[PDB]
Amino acid sequence: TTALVCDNGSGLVKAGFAGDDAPRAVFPSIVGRPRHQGVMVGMGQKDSYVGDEAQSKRGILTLKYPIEHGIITNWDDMEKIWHHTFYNELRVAPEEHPTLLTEAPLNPKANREKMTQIMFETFNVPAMYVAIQAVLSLYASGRTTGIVLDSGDGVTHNVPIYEGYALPHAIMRLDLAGRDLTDYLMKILTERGYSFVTTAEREIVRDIKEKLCYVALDFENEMATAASSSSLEKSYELPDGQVITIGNERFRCPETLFQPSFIGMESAGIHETTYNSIMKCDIDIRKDLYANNVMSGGTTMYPGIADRMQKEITALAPSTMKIKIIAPPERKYSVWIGGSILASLSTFQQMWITKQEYDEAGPSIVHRKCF
Amino acid sequence: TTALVCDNGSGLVKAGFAGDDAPRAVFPSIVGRPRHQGVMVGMGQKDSYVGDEAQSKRGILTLKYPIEHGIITNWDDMEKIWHHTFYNELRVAPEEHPTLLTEAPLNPKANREKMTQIMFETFNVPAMYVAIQAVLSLYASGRTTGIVLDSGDGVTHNVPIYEGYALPHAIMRLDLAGRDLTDYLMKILTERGYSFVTTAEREIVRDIKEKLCYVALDFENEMATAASSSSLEKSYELPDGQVITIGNERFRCPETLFQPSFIGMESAGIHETTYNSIMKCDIDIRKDLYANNVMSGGTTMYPGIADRMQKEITALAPSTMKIKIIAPPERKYSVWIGGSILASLSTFQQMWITKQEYDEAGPSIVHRKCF
Amino acid sequence: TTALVCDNGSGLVKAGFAGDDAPRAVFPSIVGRPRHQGVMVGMGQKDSYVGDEAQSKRGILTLKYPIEHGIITNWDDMEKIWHHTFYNELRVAPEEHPTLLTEAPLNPKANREKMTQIMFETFNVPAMYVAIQAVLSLYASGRTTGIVLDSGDGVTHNVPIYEGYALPHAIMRLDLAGRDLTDYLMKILTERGYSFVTTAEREIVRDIKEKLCYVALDFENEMATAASSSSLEKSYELPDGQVITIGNERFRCPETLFQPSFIGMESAGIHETTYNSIMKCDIDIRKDLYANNVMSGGTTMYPGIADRMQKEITALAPSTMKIKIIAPPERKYSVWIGGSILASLSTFQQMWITKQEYDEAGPSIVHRKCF
């Protein structure tokens, strides 16, 4: 009578039921394995931990992300996460009803192939569908025209859509994403005088980022200010009680999105990419696209990011254009929300790939029945 | 008319004059303080010993290393060592001419700040420059392209360089270094049946390591052999005349570099780190980097280490690649040698930081004029 | 149907059966030999005494400890003690059922080798297992996470455990133990004006220590007080009726654990060692370790030792950390108790080393089947 909806992308796993206005299962896509000799007999432990388990005992566990840059690499672990998701988190047998999976655009074909197969073979899912995340963001916004900027953990991408009719030749994909920012920050902190190198420590850094970092509207003068004022400095307490103080790194990390070159990322800045996608669209619709830029994903949560995008685009764009950055509260869950909407849509029903069809056509059907 | 060149890193202090083909001052970066009640009046002793003095009377003295993991921690003692270096060893007033100091990449900013200041305030040095040790190794080799593996006492690091143009985003830093191997060995020896716990004893262990240990090209079968043959066993005479015999520990200690997990070091093995640095480089230059891997530093002196690196990389790398491990005699002094070269280079002259500039800009200049 | 459990460490020998809540055999690990010419024919004496026999006639006997610093040195005498233990004390034929032996971590390999062999050859024990004492202490406490401080007669050690998964790279071993404190005290008493030099006299001193000594929470002012007040002084009656009076030595001896330098022990104080072990653990678990510090062994019986540890750690640790020193009554028998628990555990059964396995693999099995 319903369907499962989930954001099986990088970073976090979001899941719930169609029609729900919020995911209930929200936890890290992390698999952990111990790297020390277990001693106490009777400890009652396992050789694999997932999500919150992994975070809880990260000082012992070696943590891995099955998903890298939106690509599933460790299929065994991937399977485990889904297993956990369905039974431990959602408390539901997926075999009973259809599931909506999502992905970033432009992934190696095989990624879809195996996803499809697993759903049919391990989970024996009644029906399934793979959707592009950017598209889902529009459903969340309730708009048919705009440019979706989905910037998650492993991947950032741009999909211009005009009353539907997505324009594939204008889709941009950028590797530079939250995970890279995290890594970069680690190196910056070394400069400041703090060392983080274990995987657990990496996760701590992530926590820091998510709380303290913000986007400057004038990076140059932001640094000028930082260089002469403790007002930008801010303290933070680490898990063992130590207190650290962050200086100009608080905004230097975010800046990377606008200047990828900081990490050797040859590619253009996020606002240039955005702009370029528009440039690949016909002059007739460019205006509308400027009107509806839509933010989406966890990295769009940095304070001021909207304003920075606005400024940057304003500069690149022609004058008297209505540059509007749509960036609503809860945009962190945009995609998942959109999924709930789409799944609840009755019309959508005829897009499901059935097992029947799978059996007859094979896994290649995902490149024909499903967009 | 000249300049001082020194390796002020962990472990040993190397120093000499620009243009010299070998350092003349070579002694331990160790400061010693007595921990027993002096009795004989007229003994003519001091409350602080340095280098050879410290080694000579290590049974009495508490020995410390001002430098830990490439970071100066005890500045007072640091100062003392430099003092000793300049006047007792080199027999020269540093105030007369410029000095080249070195460091490992990615150190807490403050480390440079204080170094700079001290040189200008305590020693009043005419001019100075801080260089990355890895870079210097290439000058010693006479190459502009390669990957330098500088593996010293407190720190190991990787810096890929392509006709200059070092690639900062690919620089790796690894805590696992010779000092840790020493410590590890101590624990292993306990197993064998020998106890070493005093600081002086630690130094003895170091001596042992440097003479007897070697790298296996097949750790697994090396152990299989050891387990059934005294041919691997080798005797050694301790300072008090006792004779000890080393078994499989002779190669188990070195192995740690390839399997850091032995000491709880989550981090990847030294050959994996090397490889990964290459992976962070663009495909166009990767080939050249495989061709020029350059060993550097005291830990690259273990017999067979080159061959082991070769084998390991060969396995990780694509086939038909020219994996060449450059590991020349005297690579233990690589950095210092490179320093001599660089300092003698006339072009280099315009990189010196003058006191004038220091006074005007402040110590922060080290992050702008100096790389 | 059961198993023998014993603390065959230094100092005292504890033994009983699995499931018992207290050891029944509790006596000194001492072997005595006469050193005077026996005269009265028919005296009915022996050339070797053990435990209580040794104490009873210590004025005649030369007393020795087979175990020194947790290492068995005099195997002949060791055997004798075990013999006594099994037949004279426990009144049981060990050949009938399995035995749990224990040891401090980081002992010369050969120590285990011979133990194993003897159990199989002299006693022909059905099955055996060697456990680390620290681990057993946690079983006694019923906790899976904490830092065990086992401070016995010949050795003190620290083993951090996190839900099992002991962290071997963080295990500390300290020679400074109760036997050394005893010896030190003897020298201090000389100052006071009492001479103790025979082995029997050494044992008397031990008795004194165990009754009168206590730990100060402010050693400096404790001395200031002592220096001007008989309220700290306390009398004691020696075996021959003489009465002695102890002054500030009553707390000076205990202090040595916090300042090892008193006996030339270069090593850091017991609280520094504790702390350092924590420092070797990943930041993620450090908090928990601070919460569960567990005392264990006879030296943790000095009044106020818990409070002193608390204070010292509190000072070294970050603020707002829950520094809790767990130090329950009967902690003197912690290990033995834990042994009883572990042995009674049915799951544990599959850890026993059988004679079958021994015969096939040889004594080296103790380094593979047994932790």
Binding site: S195, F196, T198 | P108 | -
Partner: peptide, 7 residues
């Protein structure tokens, strides 16, 4: 250092 390691 002031975080992970003990430098």
């Amino acid at each position: 250092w002031x975080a992970x390691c003990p430098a």
